């Protein structure tokens, strides 16, 4: 369905998204510390499907800044 569901709760397209292997919803790669395609692992699960250590406040900060300057 092309649904973005990310830890920033700012679910519009930022230009670089990655799809959860399980729920098939998409996340912003940068919110998960994935800066380019090379940093994306073979297997990938979102934080909802597999809770991980991830900086949620930083994710929100980055996405909110993108929105605030567009």
């Amino acid at each position: 369905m092309g649904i973005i569901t990310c830890i920033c709760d700012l679910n519009d397209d930022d230009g670089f998204t990655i799809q959860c292997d399980h729920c098939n919803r998409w996340q912003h790669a940068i919110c998960y510390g994935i800066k380019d395609i090379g940093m994306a692992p073979d297997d990938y699960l979102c934080n909802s499907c597999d809770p991980r250590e991830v900086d949620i406040n930083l994710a929100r900060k980055i996405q909110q800044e993108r929105i605030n300057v567009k």
Partner: peptide
Amino acid sequence: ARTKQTARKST
């Protein structure tokens, strides 16, 4: 993983 990435280029 499966990814989408949009490139924006002017000329």
